[PDB]
């Protein structure tokens, strides 16, 4: 209220002590627990923690990978937390050599069950799947307890070193010959409405385009064949209901200079990846386009 207190400078949070420090200091005792510096206090990255069975956590022990929950009409295990690579197993976009590579590592009773639940129901994938963000730490227990982030950067505790985002080469997709200073990274599930297969194409779009109309124009321009396949399935097969030939959502934005080619190793199996070092997640809902 006073002009001294109003024009007083704002208080540094790192200079003032914790509530526990002043609480212990008031009654003046001592505990064996060191309390004077609380960890994770200066953490803008709001995180969450997820239990998941052992059969899905391979190629995840290295930090930095997507995580997607699904829905299944069965009641008790109803939501599986599938990694992006097990999602890419199902996708028709990936090369068959890499497909037989990363299927050979994911031989588990939970992974094949998730693969059956992907293609069992009548729903398409975009009405079924739901992102969570990228993962930063593992637990590697008998069941695994991963730590994903909803918003913010990807870093180790104490912020000693930043965590990168990994994506396989086949899901990587750019639409410009040179990049801007900033570029967003998206998710694309495009639907081939073909007779024999309905397996989609999975992509990430490291593009410098933020506006949705100027993004969806280039999205239609690069995926004209898929919309032509959609309208061909519309005219050839009557009384069918096709919808959302491609879907699009925002995943984050990168530094546009640390993007480089590295590789993941799990059980001496190389898997080449595009790696984005200083990256912050930024989630959004599944918009669609036809």
């Amino acid at each position: 209220m006073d002009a001294r207190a109003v024009a007083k400078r704002p208080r540094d949070p790192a200079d003032e002590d914790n509530e526990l420090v002043t609480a212990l200091k008031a009654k003046r005792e001592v505990n064996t627990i060191s309390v004077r510096y609380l960890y994770h206090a200066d953490h803008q990255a709001l995180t969450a923690r997820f239990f998941v069975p052992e059969g899905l956590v391979e190629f995840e022990a290295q930090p930095g990978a997507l995580l997607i929950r699904m829905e299944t009409g069965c009641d008790s295990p109803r939501h599986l937390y599938i990694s992006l690579y097990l999602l890419g197993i199902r996708a028709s976009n990936v090369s068959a050599s890499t497909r037989c590579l990363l299927e050979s590592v994911y031989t588990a009773s939970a992974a094949r069950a998730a693969l059956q639940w992907l293609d069992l129901g009548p729903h398409l994938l975009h009405r079924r799947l739901e992102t969570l963000g990228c993962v930063k730490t593992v637990s590697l227990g008998i069941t695994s307890l991963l730590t994903c982030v909803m918003r913010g950067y990807l870093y180790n505790t104490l912020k000693t070193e930043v965590f990168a985002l990994m994506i396989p080469k086949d899901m990587y997709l750019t639409w410009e010959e040179t990049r801007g200073r900033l570029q967003y990274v998206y998710l694309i599930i495009v639907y081939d409405y073909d007779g024999p297969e309905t397996r989609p194409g999975i992509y990430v779009l490291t593009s410098s385009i933020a506006h949705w109309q100027t993004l969806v124009d280039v999205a239609r321009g690069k995926f004209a064949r898929e919309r032509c396949s959609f309208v061909n399935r519309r005219i050839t097969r009557p009384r069918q209901i096709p919808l959302c030939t491609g879907v699009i959502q925002k995943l984050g934005w990168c530094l546009a200079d640390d993007i480089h080619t590295s590789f993941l190793v799990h059980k001496e199996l190389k898997l080449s990846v595009v790696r984005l070092d200083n990256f912050s997640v930024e989630l959004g809902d599944f918009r669609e386009f036809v």
Partner: protein, 289 residues
């Protein structure tokens, strides 16, 4: 060290039983028509917008632009409210009828259960009855919107038994351990005005889009640089196997009936579950506005 909050007061007297009822709703969502600082209790929730003649659609249209807030604390002096912001997490009660899970996209809905009920008996003063909007997962909200719209579309043929069977099929909605039903929008064998204009705009844009298409693709065909255009017209030609001011008026009519349907064809996510507490009374969710 205080935080920026909203000081809401009550002009009616409050019992200790009503204070104990109000302190059950700590992490409850409350819409507010304008984020003032010293607001009365008459603008907490939706009892300002309860109407006998109006319906669910105008409640959804108002709730699209309401300033949603959270409660902090209740006192005999006053009541504390908290405006959320984007990119921060908050605890929020599950006053909705459906339990949640982690990572579910959540959004705010007007209450289907209306008026006096065993669950709507919250903070009920003399002329006042505090009502709270539901916090539902997103696909159930989409299902409720579609089913309520199509139950509104069958309003003019309730005499047929088959249509009543389809309505009784639509009126029951299952979910994960959730078999709740909704009220039918037709009362007194008539439809409420906002739902009537919504489905009327739906039928009007469907009729106008079926009408004007062939002339426009015929006009576009003489500059054919896109092979999608000829299969676009072949679709309409296989489906069948004007004054210029009329054309202008029909275009503007189609776009204004689309613009009046903007709030129903899409919605935004409000919260997503960072994690859920056991007993599912409440959950920690990050605000998304």
């Amino acid at each position: 060290a205080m935080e920026a909050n909203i000081f809401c007061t009550f002009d009616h007297k409050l019992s200790i039983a009503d204070v104990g009822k109000l302190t059950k709703l700590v992490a409850a969502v409350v819409p507010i028509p304008q984020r003032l600082h010293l607001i009365k209790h008459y603008q907490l929730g939706l009892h300002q917008f309860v109407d006998h003649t109006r319906g669910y659609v105008r409640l959804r249209g108002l709730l699209r632009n309401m300033t949603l807030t959270l409660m902090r604390r209740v006192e005999g002096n006053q009541i504390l409210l908290h405006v959320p912001t984007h990119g921060l997490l908050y605890t929020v009660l599950n006053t909705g009828p459906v339990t949640w899970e982690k990572g579910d996209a959540l959004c705010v809905l007007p209450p289907l259960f209306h008026g006096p009920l065993a669950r709507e008996n919250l903070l009920t003063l003399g002329q006042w009855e505090l009502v709270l909007p539901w916090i539902v997962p997103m696909p159930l909200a989409l299902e409720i919107n579609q089913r309520l719209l199509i139950m509104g579309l069958f309003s003019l043929d309730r005499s047929y038994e088959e249509v009543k069977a389809a309505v009784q099929q639509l009126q029951t909605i299952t979910f994960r351990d959730a078999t709740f039903t909704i009220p039918d929008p037709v009362i007194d064998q008539h439809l409420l005005i906002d739902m009537k204009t919504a489905c009327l705009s739906m039928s009007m844009v469907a009729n106008l889009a079926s009408e004007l298409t062939m002339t426009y693709v015929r006009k576009l065909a003489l500059e054919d640089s896109s092979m999608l255009l000829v299969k676009c017209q072949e679709l309409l030609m296989r489906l069948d196997r004007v004054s210029p001011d009329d054309e202008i008026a029909r275009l503007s009519a189609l776009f204004v009936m689309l613009r009046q349907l903007d709030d129903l064809i899409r919605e935004q996510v409000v919260f997503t579950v960072c994690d859920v507490s056991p007993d599912n009374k409440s959950a920690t969710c990050i605000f998304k506005g």
